[PDB]
Structure to design on (726 residues):
């Protein structure tokens, strides 16, 4: 029959029917990842987790980091995970979201941007503010992949504060609680991922170790923000000290700790380099998004560095990149590989002569 | 201002603003690909092309191949490319699309499924009919990335034929031309890709060589269908003869043509194997989609074959796979890597003892 065979779906129903095209695999994947385990901290090991779950988390986390670019007066992000209750909350300060009726869509601005698809402050490519956000899906994707999803924000400029809760995959919602407000701006997103959509029973060791690492990553990647994880400040300040998490207790060929060369080439390019004993490795960030497969920004810096010293060189390089790119593109929705051409990055990276010399004498 | 900063987009406007998240990169990419060049045919070489363009083409092409699964009485697909006029047309026979009013959406069924987003015959996972189609975007994506887009179809069962033309990125359309019809069913999609969205001036040698290869690929992958390219039947029948396109004039270490082992393990798994002298290579298809990066179906067969003969073995294998999978998933929209777990493929592949023995004595 024609109406059973040929079907239109709503957007919301399409996301739930085709989860993997929006949030990546909802099936387990086993691979070697850098994670931060409670007892031993930063280590590379075999991890089994669901990419789709990692990704709705990372979406809320990158949104906090974007706010720093939105408002440089932002100083802090708190990340909290309660595995036993199934709760994740991410809090930032600095400017909040205007708590007012949008005059075109006739709803409160936070309602619109967390409750309706294809909504964003980043559709105009006002180049400046190099946010990881771009498409206007991430926050709704978390909401839809959650049994419960709470947005609190307050914006002094607009004199009000906002709270609204969503439930059952964004199919159900309270009315906004709206109040007068004159305090410090904050946004706080609190959600319970819908573990049944990922075939998991609990947030397990492996996913909490992955999620914990992204909080370190934020401390490492996001200049000028303290990060607290479960109520504690992460002892990371500057990129070099984040890199130190990885090279702590690594040896060269002669049993001597690794030497690390660092240059902040400009605001958009922070670069550390040492010897690899394990082939080509890279740790890299674009707009605080972890490009774990890398891409054109890694190629761009590595070609330069390889410039001085053919592809056998690449084989002994361990490169750490923290960069900012205008309108990053990715070869998939899980964003581990950034595909933008160098031409249209909006910046250049020229490492100094001091760095190339310093890079000779390290391995 | 709040309504300039916080924006909702329509679906259509979002696709045009964020092309790369739907059709892959709209920027050039340079890499080594198998292509079919007019003069020399199947060869591996350096090619510069736009993934997004390849992909709207491939979407119309996989839809033709899916129809074979829809109706096994289908015998032919004609592919035609006129670079100078900027026209691509793909014709298939076998059952057409019901030319009737959809009683729920109140439009002609072909209008609905080529003119409205998120429309498909493949949303119910009626496992059987292992089509590459699944999400209900592909055909609209071609339409949207076209200056002009024409759908003709006819379905004898429903006594009518249909023609409708779309223009300017699916923003403009004629009324359906609807007629009485009693002839042989066909569907014919004719489009002019919008070269301005891909920064190209003409369909160039490299893209026509890529597109031509997919027609060979179809002849190779789609059992029981003749393929014509620019009015000529492709001299391919069966998978072994397609594989022959690749191994023609290849040598082993002793200057002797490559020996090729073939088994059709079952309808869903056709497998050819020879020696590689160039590391691990694979040519593979899932539901007639070219998995050029491979995935869990390649891993599945290779592990088996590697089973008999550790990862140094992989290094001397050139494997060709034509398979059928129920509800394939992919790690990106350009679908070169298939991510479904073997468990839920809907079939098994056990290669016979004859094949493992035959595979010893080939290199
Ligand atoms: N923590 C936050 N602080 C302030 N604004 C936020 C925060 N999280 C999200 N937003 C706003 O909500 C919008 C919707 O977010 P999202 O769905 O992630 O889309 P985007 O791709 O723009 O990040 C953002 O564009 C931004 O304007
Ligand atoms: N050549 C064809 N012959 C018959 N039906 C077709 C053809 N091309 C497309 N269709 C129909 O149009 C629908 C829309 O196509 P598409 O956007 O590619 O989505 P899907 O992911 O289902 O392939 C298909 O589901 C199928 O029902
Ligand atoms: C929009 C989707 C993208 C993958 N589409 C959905 C689909 O099923 N098929 C397609 O080819 C197009 N992307 C993921 C997401 O969550 N947000 C995006 O805008 C991109
Ligand atoms: Mg975002
Ligand atoms: Mg299709």
């Amino acid at each position: 029959s024609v109406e059973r065979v040929y079907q239109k779906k709503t957007q919301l129903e399409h996301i739930l029917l085709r989860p993997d095209t929006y949030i990546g695999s909802v099936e387990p994947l086993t691979q070697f990842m850098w994670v931060y385990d409670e007892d031993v901290g930063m280590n590379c090991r075999e991890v089994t987790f669901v990419p789709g779950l990692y990704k709705i988390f990372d979406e809320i986390l990158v949104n906090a980091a974007d706010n720093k670019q939105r408002d440089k007066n932002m100083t802090c992000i708190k990340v909290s995970i309660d595995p036993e209750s199934n709760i994740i909350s991410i809090w930032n300060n600095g400017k909040g979201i205007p708590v007012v009726e949008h005059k075109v869509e006739k709803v409160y601005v936070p309602a619109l941007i967390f409750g309706q698809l294809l909504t964003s402050s980043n559709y105009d490519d006002d180049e400046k503010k190099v946010t990881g956000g771009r498409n206007g899906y991430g926050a709704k994707l978390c909401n839809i992949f959650s049994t419960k999803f709470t947005v609190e924000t307050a914006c002094k400029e607009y004199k009000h504060s906002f709270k609204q809760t969503w439930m059952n995959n964004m199919m159900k919602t309270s009315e906004a609680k709206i109040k007068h407000f004159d305090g410090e701006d904050y946004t706080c997103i609190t959600f319970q991922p819908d573990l049944s959509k990922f075939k998991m029973e609990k947030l397990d060791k492996d996913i909490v170790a992955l999620m914990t690492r992204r909080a370190y990553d934020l401390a490492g990647s996001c200049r000028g923000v303290k990060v607290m994880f479960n109520g504690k400040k992460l002892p990371v300040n500057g990129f070099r000290s984040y890199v130190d998490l990885y090279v702590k207790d690594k040896l060269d060929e002669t049993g001597v700790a690794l030497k690390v060369i660092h240059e902040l080439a400009n605001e958009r390019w922070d670069v550390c380099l040492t010897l690899s004993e394990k082939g080509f490795q890279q740790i890299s960030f674009v707009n605080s998004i972890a490009t774990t497969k890398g891409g054109r920004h890694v190629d761009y810096v590595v070609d330069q560095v390889v410039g001085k010293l053919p592809f056998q060189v690449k084989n002994h390089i361990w490169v750490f990149i923290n960069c900012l790119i205008e309108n990053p593109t990715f070869d998939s929705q899980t964003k581990e590989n950034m595909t933008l051409q160098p031409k249209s990055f909006g910046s250049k990276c020229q490492l100094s002569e001091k760095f190339f010399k310093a890079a000779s004498n390290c391995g």
